[PDB]
Amino acid sequence: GFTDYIVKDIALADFGRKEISLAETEMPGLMATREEYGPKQPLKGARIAGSLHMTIQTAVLIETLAALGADIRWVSCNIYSTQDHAAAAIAAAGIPVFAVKGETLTEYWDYTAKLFDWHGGGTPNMILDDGGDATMLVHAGYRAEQGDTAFLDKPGSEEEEIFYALVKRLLKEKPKGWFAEIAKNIKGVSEETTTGVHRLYEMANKGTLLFPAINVNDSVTKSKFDNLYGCRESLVDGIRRGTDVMLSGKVAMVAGFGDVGKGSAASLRQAGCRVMVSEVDPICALQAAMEGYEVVTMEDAAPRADIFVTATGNKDIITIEHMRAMKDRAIVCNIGHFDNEIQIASLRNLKWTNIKPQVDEIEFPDKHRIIMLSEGRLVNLGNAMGHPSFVMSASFTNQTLAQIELFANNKDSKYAKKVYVLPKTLDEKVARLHLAKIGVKLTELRKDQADYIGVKQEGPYKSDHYRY
Amino acid sequence: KPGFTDYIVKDIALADFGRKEISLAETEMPGLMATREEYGPKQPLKGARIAGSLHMTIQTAVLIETLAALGADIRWVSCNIYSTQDHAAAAIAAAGIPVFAVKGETLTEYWDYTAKLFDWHGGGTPNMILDDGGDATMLVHAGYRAEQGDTAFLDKPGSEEEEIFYALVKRLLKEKPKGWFAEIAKNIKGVSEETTTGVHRLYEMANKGTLLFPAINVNDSVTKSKFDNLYGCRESLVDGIRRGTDVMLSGKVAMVAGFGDVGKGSAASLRQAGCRVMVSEVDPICALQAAMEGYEVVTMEDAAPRADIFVTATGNKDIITIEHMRAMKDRAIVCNIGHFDNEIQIASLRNLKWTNIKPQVDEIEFPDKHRIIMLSEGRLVNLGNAMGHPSFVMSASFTNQTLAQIELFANNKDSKYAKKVYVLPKTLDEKVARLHLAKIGVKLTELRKDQADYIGVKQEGPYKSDHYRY
Amino acid sequence: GFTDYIVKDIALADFGRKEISLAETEMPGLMATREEYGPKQPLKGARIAGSLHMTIQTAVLIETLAALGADIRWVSCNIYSTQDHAAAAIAAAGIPVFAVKGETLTEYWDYTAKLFDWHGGGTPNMILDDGGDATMLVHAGYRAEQGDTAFLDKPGSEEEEIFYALVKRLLKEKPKGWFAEIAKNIKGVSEETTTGVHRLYEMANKGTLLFPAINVNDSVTKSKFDNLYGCRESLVDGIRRGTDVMLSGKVAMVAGFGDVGKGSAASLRQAGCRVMVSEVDPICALQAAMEGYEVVTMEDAAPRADIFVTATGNKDIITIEHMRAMKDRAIVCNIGHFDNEIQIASLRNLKWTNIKPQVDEIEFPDKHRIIMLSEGRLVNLGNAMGHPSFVMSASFTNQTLAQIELFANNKDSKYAKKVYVLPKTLDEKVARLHLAKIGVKLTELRKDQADYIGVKQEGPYKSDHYRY
Amino acid sequence: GFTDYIVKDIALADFGRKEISLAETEMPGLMATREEYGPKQPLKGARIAGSLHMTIQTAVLIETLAALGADIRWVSCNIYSTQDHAAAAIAAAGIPVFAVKGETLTEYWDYTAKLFDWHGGGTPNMILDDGGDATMLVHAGYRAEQGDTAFLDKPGSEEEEIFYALVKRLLKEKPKGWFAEIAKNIKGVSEETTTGVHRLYEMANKGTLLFPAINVNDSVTKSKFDNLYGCRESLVDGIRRGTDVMLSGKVAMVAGFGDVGKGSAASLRQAGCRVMVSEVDPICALQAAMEGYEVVTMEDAAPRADIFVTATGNKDIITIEHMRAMKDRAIVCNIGHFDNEIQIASLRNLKWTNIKPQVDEIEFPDKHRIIMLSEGRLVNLGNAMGHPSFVMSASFTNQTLAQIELFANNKDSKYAKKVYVLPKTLDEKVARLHLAKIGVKLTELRKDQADYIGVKQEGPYKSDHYRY
Ligand SMILES: Nc1ncnc2c1ncn2[C@@H]1O[C@H](CO)[C@@H](O)[C@H]1O
Ligand SMILES: Nc1ncnc2c1ncn2[C@@H]1O[C@H](CO)[C@@H](O)[C@H]1O
Ligand SMILES: Nc1ncnc2c1ncn2[C@@H]1O[C@H](CO)[C@@H](O)[C@H]1O
Ligand SMILES: Nc1ncnc2c1ncn2[C@@H]1O[C@H](CO)[C@@H](O)[C@H]1O
Ligand SMILES: Nc1ncnc2c1ncn2[C@@H]1O[C@H](CO)[C@@H](O)[C@H]1O
Ligand SMILES: Nc1ncnc2c1ncn2[C@@H]1O[C@H](CO)[C@@H](O)[C@H]1O
Ligand SMILES: Nc1ncnc2c1ncn2[C@@H]1O[C@H](CO)[C@@H](O)[C@H]1O
Ligand SMILES: Nc1ncnc2c1ncn2[C@@H]1O[C@H](CO)[C@@H](O)[C@H]1O
Ligand code: NA
Ligand code: NA
Ligand code: NA
Ligand code: NA
């Protein structure tokens, strides 16, 4: 039978299956992908270790991969983002998953290592990564197993301390050569997110990347949809569920005006806030001003905004000094990927009063307070349900095609140990698969029209440098 | 000291959580908190015995505790079977105030609880009613009518709810002392009422001469049309739909039936969240407004096969029928933000297969296997699937309610309020708005005396004629 | 040989006729009114003196009145609002009109007086007024003729001085008792505008109103459409034609948040400005705040807005002190109806440099400059073309119906010397006449549904105090 | 004094100078570029032949180039886009310019040729091009001079035959080797638009590009600003001036959802239209749908839109059949670069009635009509004033830096006979120069923060593939 999982509560599986089924209707790209490739079973023989937010949307991805023949083990890539009913449904479907909403950082890393303990013996031969954590376990352990262990002795953060301790433990406990075995078996890794892509390009440029990688983040139908439209929908959802505050009449500050900040500022303005923005990039700042946002510094915003959202991917955006200047019961949250955008650690010796899960009131010596959401981690996934299914279908269709590329379309070793992106025609295919469900009717070029603009009728329609 | 038992809530252990969100809400309701400060010293509701029937939310908890802070004795129920927020109800019970309200109580339970308002703790009856939808008011008048001998109507129910209500009146007539409804009627000093249907029926009883006590219509305050209905629904309609379904709104088509103030706010809610919004209307002025706001104005027959989301906002009946729902696309979402559960023909769906997804979310399957997603069984979706309107906008409505309670209870020594329906003056509308400006950082300009004279108003207001529409 | 007119240049008549024809297609309420009432000729025998912005839209109103049997003389109610080609077309059709874009204030009032010199002898018997200027001429003259002359020597502005000069001249030049003769013959006035309606109530309150009046301003289908949607379209139109400035990136200040201020703030926001608002009314200030506008004082706004729009109906809103504090080349304009919202008179000792018609640059002693549009008068009509035809059709269908009421439907004296409003049944009918052109499909109440909400199937649908 | 120009009326110079002065305040990037490079005179010795819309904004660019030392001759790149007062001011400043609003196609091309007859003898040594017309004349003439003349006899449109007639006339009239002489002396071309850049890459890929090229279109601070925000402001402006129609209540159709179509659809939605879009590219279609636009075919839109806007860069988008099915008095216009998106030529057999400059009513035999703007040419520039100055300052600051690059910074032959874009640091500087004018306050990265995200504090802040 099947017992190989760790979830909050398996009795949530029925509720998970109901919402998965509903999500399927909202994820036409993944469902069409099942129909197209189901008969050819291109992932038969794949052993996919997946590390990505264990949500309802990711469940539809998991089952798509399975529908295509893949064998799978899964973990979440964040401690708070798991939806426990999604995890229980996957476990009940007989797929190993180690994901609990609110697991500790120590648990998180121990679960990541369970990805590589393949059921029935052996290791994975594919990785599907969001943030590069599974990829980093392999590379760090390989590095150390070869004899370069110095870096493990000097961790740079609390989380890095736990991660390095994991690598040491695995080196002690596993058979000699375990990391080299893993690295040689991985046929490829498709990476979802800017932080992991950064790690890939760094490894690729030092010659230490161990297997081919596909950068799904820079697919057009990911990077121009996922956070732009996803954050537009899910950022205010998080804030409403956390606080139930009236947004009309409030002033909000968004730090950063990349894809995440863009979608986040739109979410708050559409909901009725008067939105201010900070930026270090003069082009991004100009975009913000042209969209009608006042562009200011955090020192300017600190005493006056009602709501603060960090969206920079940098560190020390909202400091202790900012939060001391904040008005009483100002709301503070983060939708960047790490919890160091806000100086959370500097608040830990203040009085915290829990309101409900992922909502805390923090009181300062002068007795003014702030409302912190999700302890300064991803507010959309921590306080609500993350991005809705339809946009995640686009990202996850890219992931599915990327797995097929690496696992089934590398007979000629067109993918070496470097970072690739999907070709534009597959990118366009992802979009195509999502048009019928929302009633889009695409115009077909006549031959004379296609020649007139220098494209084939069937695409690709734009050069590879086109920015959309 | 002694153990308090005079309540019915889901779980008393939610009281600490309720108290926490009540405290947060106080900061967001400056109108109520200022009213506490102003009238606290004079205790204008000392001696008031207020029976309240209003959605037992966090926001209503602040209203309740405002009434109490002004001296009132209180018993409370919700006015909708799904609108209660169980932590708010628990906090009120823990404060020793009788409350009978559970999210997801049945209709039969609902009406039993309404009756409990009138059994005053320690003896006697209420002497004030704070009503939302007229249910407490109707119980008194229907019982009085039957107690006086006119009983035929009790055997003529037009809905399941009327069946249950008429059964309740019959039971109360059998169980309570003779003359009970007359006694209640004699002791009620006034009612304040917030809703369009509640107000409609007050005016109708007034014209018929059957209204039993003075009434104040707070529904025609500028607050209800221009703030509560408009901005509340703009904020809370999509909230309800998101929590119920987690669907992506960008890319979807939505249909809103009605374009009065609730449909205005509802359509705005959906458009701001990224839907393409269509609207239906029977009023050509309201329809022309919708068109001018950029909404396509179509019939429900037109909308039925093509919208992804349907929202009823008409206050009328039989808006979305069994025929319309048969024609909808698979897994269209249907919900109601008008006040009664008959805008959608929910009763005609009960012979079909219902699969419950989670509280207030059900998937309904037709014989051709096509499905719809029904929110809150056709009842107020913002309150059923989410947390209703946010605290800041309820502050103004609830300040109006408090002011109306003061007027009827404390300011009727001269009988300025007969057995008729009255409205608060514009000076109160301006004062209530003014109480909210500082919280959201509004800097009001002060007219100089010459500018005041030039436009023909006093520097302190009122600034508009009484027929001004804002 | 028709000579009884004054226009800038009669050669523009052909161009005027073409745009009048286009506007008819855009004004279905007026054209439906011609079809319904043409056979009966209810305005046969009416002698309408009209004082209302001589635009293409007003030309369609004029010709609607004429199609119903009216004899007409016409003037503009503002010195910059005339569209010279519309005026030419009216004159070319044999209708006396005295309206030149850019006429002087003295000419303006001379022209108002010509309304009452009926061609072929006599006086008018109806007034259609916008702003109350023609009504005021009759009442001030009557007042003085009856012996109460002192006010004629107490002017408080240049315009009052000119108006009182006109009254003195007419009393010297016309037959004794002329004003009483006019007053006796005017069957009614219909008044369009808040300023004129306030003049009407003053006089009705005092018992000095000389004839019945219908307040068209407070039709729903005027005051919930005319200013709200008209200014939303025409305010930025005026600013763009006058200055061609980029509105995205700029900050705008709107004084006033009545229906003109509501429409004006909307126009600017939709055009990409960040909009701020001043108000004295806490209900309107709270509306503005709930719509996401920052509500501030003009002292706060003066050094930081790029664009200033007064919309108050009050005086001394933007002062010389405000304008000295403004940034170099800030834009200032007015869409309230006088020209004392901004302190224009106080600017007349400064160096003015004309850029083009209705656009001037005013230089202060410190060399900073402001850009003044239409000399502080109505900016949508002065720098552009006013509200677009469609929304004016609703207002002007109201006017036509009000003229019919007073002229043809007062045989029983239901309208005494007081101010009346059109009934809601007519208001709903005005709305109905515009629905098909924009493709609205109205739902029809079934009888049980009409009974359920307490209305007749055919309306009216709302109580008389409903605010929409 | 100075005689070498062709403009509509030199008396318009004073008016031109006033609006240029006003634009200078609105174009800080250009004025700051004058401040920075003026003392260096980087364009001393430059002989720039410019082909670009002779607007007020282009005047500031021309005078900027002159201020940096350039000798200049100029023409418009469209027969309707000239602003006559701008042209007159330029002429009056002593700069040869040949640009009249409403010039004929034959005049247009004859003027283009006048660019290359340099005043005082010789040829230009730089080209500043918008749409590649000046570039094409040089390369077409070279190709024929080299002996490949067959193409000049196979024309396909009216403008094509005029262009080939021009080339033949110049070959016949000028000395032998004239185009080779021009090509030898052209140091570089900077090109502003998609159409022109497309021609450039094609020539560069065939080895036939005759001189270095900089593609200014794909600067981020051009492509993500110019038509995104420019069309958002200027498309409805053109429609309003041309027709004065109420946009609220109306349905509009935009063909295309590239940057021009994105900005155009926004222009119409913000003005109050319900907006439908067509697309052939499924990614762009998905973008339109996610922004809430209904995505339809032209066959679907033809009988129900009130307003049609072509923005595809393609041909045969709105056909005679489409137009026969449009409702009476539908508005039709084009904001793509040539007049073949709409089948204007097929309309030349019907009754055209001119309303006013650039506005025509076209009658079909069944008497239904359409309103055509600018005879199907660039509506924002033909019916109004094009993009406002502020956004053009960014475009034109890029142009100035491109001319400096090619003329003054090619001592090491870093620019060969291929197409280049400006470096990201210069792109960032362009945005930087515009921030203060709109009150943007940019955050400065701390050293530790810049390290953390992998950039220098002074930028570049994004990789070269970042899409913004
Ligand atoms: N300290 C910071 N403050 C504001 N924005 C930042 C900061 N660091 C990076 N960003 C911006 O955040 C976006 C996403 O990384 C980028 O556009 C980047 O310029
Ligand atoms: N429902 C979801 N399932 C999986 N990943 C998600 C979901 N919502 C957001 N994300 C991802 O989590 C981060 C926070 O939005 C982004 O990387 C985003 O792509
Ligand atoms: N059957 C109906 N369909 C659509 N709108 C309606 C219907 N009945 C009432 N309304 C509208 O609902 C709004 C709110 O009651 C009013 O503007 C009213 O005209
Ligand atoms: N949070 C809330 N608490 C109490 N009543 C509410 C709340 N939100 C909305 N309502 C009321 O419920 C109805 C639906 O919005 C309206 O009558 C409104 O006033
Ligand atoms: N001095 C003023 N400043 C700002 N708003 C004003 C002033 N006077 C009147 N108003 C407002 O202008 C609007 C239109 O008259 C009204 O809502 C009124 O309150
Ligand atoms: N095109 C127009 N024709 C006639 N009157 C107009 C026009 N545009 C605006 N108005 C009136 O002029 C004032 C300024 O918009 C308002 O009173 C408005 O009703
Ligand atoms: N025939 C066409 N119909 C609709 N859109 C088109 C057509 N041809 C090109 N486009 C789109 O126009 C945009 C601008 O070139 C591109 O996104 C392209 O896909
Ligand atoms: N005011 C202007 N001056 C010069 N070029 C312009 C102007 N406005 C728009 N353009 C250009 O003309 C085309 C149509 O908007 C685009 O290529 C745009 O860059
Ligand atoms: Na979700
Ligand atoms: Na709430
Ligand atoms: Na007009
Ligand atoms: Na311009």
Numbering used by the authors:
A (entry chain D), C (entry chain A), D (entry chain C): 6 to 473
B (entry chain B): 4 to 473
Verbatim from the authors:
SAHases (EC 3.3.1.1) catalyze the reversible hydrolysis of S-adenosyl-L-homocysteine (SAH), an important metabolite in the context of cellular methyltransferase regulation, to adenosine (Ado) and L-homocysteine (Hcy). As reported by Manszewski et al. (2017), BeSAHase can adopt three different conformations, closed, open, and semi-open, which are defined by the relative orientation of the two major domains, the substrate-binding domain (where the Ado1 site is located) and the cofactor-binding domain (in the present structure marked by Ado2). Apart from the relative positions of the substrate- and cofactor-binding domains (here referred to as conformation), BeSAHase has another structural determinant, a molecular gate that controls access to a channel leading to the active site.
The crystal belongs to the monoclinic space group P21, which is at variance with the orthorhombic system and P21212 space group that are characteristic of all previously determined BeSAHase structures. The present structure reveals a tetrameric assembly, which can be considered as a dimer of intimate dimers (AB and CD), even though the enzyme was deprived of NAD+ (because of the prior cofactor removal procedure). Indeed, the fact that no residual amounts of NAD+ were found in the electron density map confirmed the efficiency of the cofactor removal procedure with ammonium sulfate treatment. Although the molar excess over apo-enzyme was the same (12-fold) for both compounds (10 and Ado), only Ado molecules were found in the electron density maps. Interestingly, each BeSAHase subunit accommodated two Ado molecules. The other site (hereafter referred to as Ado2) coincides with the position that was previously shown to be occupied by the adenosine moiety of the NAD+ cofactor in the holo-enzyme (Manszewski et al., 2015, 2017).
